[PDB]
Amino acid sequence: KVQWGRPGNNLKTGIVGMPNVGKSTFFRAITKSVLGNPANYPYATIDPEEAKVAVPDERFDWLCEAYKPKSRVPAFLTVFDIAGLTKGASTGVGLGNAFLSHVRAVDAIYQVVRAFDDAEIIHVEGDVDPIRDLSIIVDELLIKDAEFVEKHLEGLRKITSRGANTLEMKAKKEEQAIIEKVYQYLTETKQPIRKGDWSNREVEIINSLYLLTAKPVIYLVNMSERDFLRQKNKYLPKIKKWIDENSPGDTLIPMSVAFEERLTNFTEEEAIEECKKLNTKSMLPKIIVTGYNALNLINYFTCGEDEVRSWTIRKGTKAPQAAGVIHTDFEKAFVVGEIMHYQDLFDYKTENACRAAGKYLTKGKEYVMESGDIAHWK
Numbered sequence: 001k002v003q004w005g006r007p008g009n010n011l012k013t014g015i016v017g018m019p020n021v022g023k024s025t026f027f028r029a030i031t032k033s034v035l036g037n038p039a040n041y042p043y044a045t046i047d048p049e050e051a052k053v054a055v056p057d058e059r060f061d062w063l064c065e066a067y068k069p070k071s072r073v074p075a076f077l078t079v080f081d082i083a084g085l086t087k088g089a090s091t092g093v094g095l096g097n098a099f100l101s102h103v104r105a106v107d108a109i110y111q112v113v114r115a116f117d118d119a120e121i122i123h124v125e126g127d128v129d130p131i132r133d134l135s136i137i138v139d140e141l142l143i144k145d146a147e148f149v150e151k152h153l154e155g156l157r158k159i160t161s162r163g164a165n166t167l168e169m170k171a172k173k174e175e176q177a178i179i180e181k182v183y184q185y186l187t188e189t190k191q192p193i194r195k196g197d198w199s200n201r202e203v204e205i206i207n208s209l210y211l212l213t214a215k216p217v218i219y220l221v222n223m224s225e226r227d228f229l230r231q232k233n234k235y236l237p238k239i240k241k242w243i244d245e246n247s248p249g250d251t252l253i254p255m256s257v258a259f260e261e262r263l264t265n266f267t268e269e270e271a272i273e274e275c276k277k278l279n280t281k282s283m284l285p286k287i288i289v290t291g292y293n294a295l296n297l298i299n300y301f302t303c304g305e306d307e308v309r310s311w312t313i314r315k316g317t318k319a320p321q322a323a324g325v326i327h328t329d330f331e332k333a334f335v336v337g338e339i340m341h342y343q344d345l346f347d348y349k350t351e352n353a354c355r356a357a358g359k360y361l362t363k364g365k366e367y368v369m370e371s372g373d374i375a376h377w378k
Contacts, residue, residue, distance in 0.1 A: 002200060002203065003203075003296065003314075003315075003316065004194070004203055004207070004214070004296075005107055005207065005214065005215070005216075005295075005296070006107050006207070006210070008314070009297070009312050009313055009314055009317075009325065010078070010312075011078075011107040011108070011295040011296075011297065012078035012079070012080060012105075012106050012107055012108075013077065013078065013079050013080065013106060013107065013108035013109065013110055013218075013291045013294075013295065014079070014080035014081075014082045014102065014103055014105075014106035014108075014109060014110070015027060015079065015080065015081055015082055015083070015110045015112065016082060016095070016103060016109045016110060016111045016112070016137070016217075017083070017111060017112035017113075017114075018094075018095075018112075018114065018133040018136070018137065019089065020114070020119065021112045021113070021114040021222060022112055022114070022222040022257035022258075023081070023082075023083050023112055024081070024083060024084065025257050025258075025261060026112060026220070026222065026257040026260070027051065027079070027081040027084065028261075029257055029260045029261045029264060030051050030053055030079060030284065031051045032261070032264040033260070033263070033264045033282075033284055034054075034264075034268055035053045035054045035056065035284055035285070035288065036051045036052070036053040036054070036079070036284075038052075040052060040054065040073075040074075040076070042073075048081075048084065049080060049081040049082075049084040049085045050078065050079075050080055050081070051078070051079045051080075051081070052076045052077075052078060053076065053077050053078075053079055053284075053288050054074040054075070054076060054288075055074060055075035055076060055077050055288055055289065055292045055299075055310070055312075056074075056285040056288065056289060057074070057075065057299070057310065059301070059342050059346075059372050060072075060074055060075070060301065060308070060310050062346065063301055063303050063308050063342075063345075063374070064308050066303075066345075066349065067303045067304065067305060067308050068305075069303070069304060069305060069306055069307045069308040070305075070306055070307065071306065071307040071308070071309075072307070072308050072309075073307065073308070073309040073310065074310055075292070075299050075310040075311070075312050076312070077288050077291050077292045077295075079110070079291070080102070080105075080106055082099060082102050082103055082106070083099070085102045086098045086099055086101075086102060092140075093136060094136050094137060094139075094140035095137060095140055100140075100141075100144060100212065103212060103215075104210060104212065106215065107215055107295055108215055108216050108217075108218065108291055108294045108295050109215050109216070109217040109218065110217075110218050110220055110287075110291065111137065111217050111218065111219050111220065112220045112222055113130050113133075113134060113219055113220065113221045113222065113239055114128065114130050114133070114222060115130060115221050115222060115223040115227070115233050115234065115235040115236060115239065115254075116222065116223050116224045116227070118224060130221075130235050130238070130239050131235075131238055131239065131242050134239065134242055134243075134246070135242075135246065138192065138246060138247065141192065141212045141213045142186055142187075142190065142191075142192070142213060144212050144213075145186050145193065145209075145211040145212055145213045145214075146183065146186040146187055148209065148211065149179060149182055149183040149186060149209065149211075150183060152179065152209065153176065153179045153180065153183055156172065156175065156176045156179060157176070159172065160172070160173060160176065175205060178201075178202055178205050179205070179209075181202070182202075182205075182206060182209070182211075186213065191246075191247075192213035192214075192217075192247060193206060193211050193213045193214050194213060194214050194215065194216060195247070195248070195249075216250070216294045216295075217247065217250050218250065218251045218253065218287070218290050218291060218294060219239075219243065219250060219251065219252045219253065220253050220255055220287065221233070221235075221236060221239055221252060221253065221254045221255065222255055222256065222257045223235075223236070223254060223255070223256055224256060224258060225256050225258045225259040225262065227256070228254065228255065228256035228259050228280070229256075229259070229278055229279075229280055233254065236254060239252070240252060251290050251294075253283055253286060253287055253290065254283075255283045255287070256283075259280075259282075260282060260283065260284060263275070263282050296314060296315045297312050297313070297314065297315070298312075298313060298314070298315050298369070298371040299311055299312050299313060299371065299372075300313060300322060300369050300370075300371070300372065300373035300374065300375050301342075301372070301373070301374050301375075302326065302374070302375060302376065303374055311325050311326065312325075313325060313369055316368055317368065317369055318365065318366065318367055318368050318369065319334070319337045319339075319363050319364070319365065319367040319368075319369060319375075320334040320337075320365050322369045322375070323337055323375070323377045326377070327377075330377045334365065334377075335364070335365075336362055336363065336364050337362070337363050337364075337367075337375055337376070337377050338360065338361070338362055338363075338375065338376040338377075338378075339361045339362070339363050339367070339369075339370075339373050339374070339375050340354060340355075340359065340360055340361065340373070340374040340375070340376075341359070341361070341370060341372065341373060341374075342371075342372030342373065342374060343372070344357075344359035345359075345374050
C-alpha cells in the first residue's frame with residue numbers, strides 16, 4: 001500500500017552503536033558463523049567492512065532438498081561495519097559526523113544497545129547507562145536531519161520570490177510547505193521522521209532528503225552469555241520501555257555477542273546440541289531476517305537439477321523487473337513468465353504434478369511476484 005526509503009533491491013544495513021558495545025565483536029561474529037562466513041565463494045571477495053550474510057529461509061531449505069542441485073545459492077543481507085569504515089573516534093558525545101557520513105550510505109540501522117558492565121573493575125553506579133546513550137544517538141540523528149532540512153529549506157526560500165509567479169512557483173511552494181512540516185516534526189514533535197504520519201506525496205519528498213532519521217532501526221540489546229542464557233537482564237526492562245516512549249514499533253532483539261561468538265566454534269550440528277543443552281538458540285537467524293524484512297525485501301527462486309537460487313526483490317516488484325534481476329534481457333524481451341507458487345510446488349513435490357493440476361501458472365507483465373514464487377524465464 002505504501003513504499004518508504006531508497007529505490008531498488010540492493011539495499012544494505014549498517015551496524016550503529018556507542019563506543020564499546022560489541023560492535024566489532026558482533027561483526028566479526030557474523031562474518032565467522034555459517035551465515036556470514038565467506039563460504040559463499042562467487043569470488044566476490046567482499047570488502048573487509050562488508051559482510052554478505054545468508055538469509056535463512058526454510059523454503060530455500062526444502063527446495064534445495066527437493067531438487068538437490070549441484071549448487072545452492074541463498075539470498076543475502078548486506079551488513080556494514082560502520083565503525084570499521086572510520087578508525088576515528090568522534091570527539092563529540094555521540095557518534096560523530098564521520099561515523100554518520102557512512103551511515104547515510106546505508107538503508108537500515110542495527111543499533112547495538114549495551115546491557116552489560118563486565119568492563120568495570122570498580123563500580124561508580126551511573127557509569128554504564130544504556131538509557132542515556134539510547135537517547136544520545138536519537139538526538140544526534142534528529143539534529144543532523146534538522147540541520148539538513150533547515151539548510152535545504154533555506155535553499156527553497158530563495159526561488160520563491162513573487163512577480164509572474166503562481167504559474168509554476170506554487171508547485172515548488174507546496175514542497176516548501178511540506179519540508180516545513182518535516183522540520184516542524186524533527187524539531188517540535190522531536191521524533192524520527194520515519195514515525196510521522198505522512199502521505200504518499202510527503203513520503204516521496206522526504207525520500208529525496210535521504211534523512212538519517214528515515215531509515216528503520218533494529219535494536220540489538222547485547223548482554224552477557226550468563227544473562228542471555230537465563231532470559232533475564234539488569235537493564236532489559238528499562239531499555240524496553242524507553243523504546244516504547246521514544247521509538248515505538250522498532251524491533252528489540254535481546255542477544256549476547258559473547259554467546260553468538262562462542263557458537264561459531266561449533267559445527268552446525270554441535271551448535272544445536274549445545275543450544276539444546278543450554279536450552280536456547282542463536283539469534284543471528286532472527287536478526288538477519290528482521291533486517292531483510294525491515295528493508296521491505298522478499299524473494300523468489302529459480303530451481304533446477306543444476307542450481308537452486310533465491311533472488312532478492314522488492315515487496316511489490318512485478319514479474320518483468322523480477323526477471324530483470326537475473327539477466328537484463330529477461331525484462332526487455334519479456335512477454336510472459338512461468339510461475340509456480342511455493343505452496344503448490346511444496347504440495348506436489350514436482351513440477352509435473354502441479355503442472356498437471358494446472359498449478360504451473362503463466363504470468364505476464366502485470367504480475368506482482370509472490371514471496372517464495374518459483375519462476376522460470378525463457
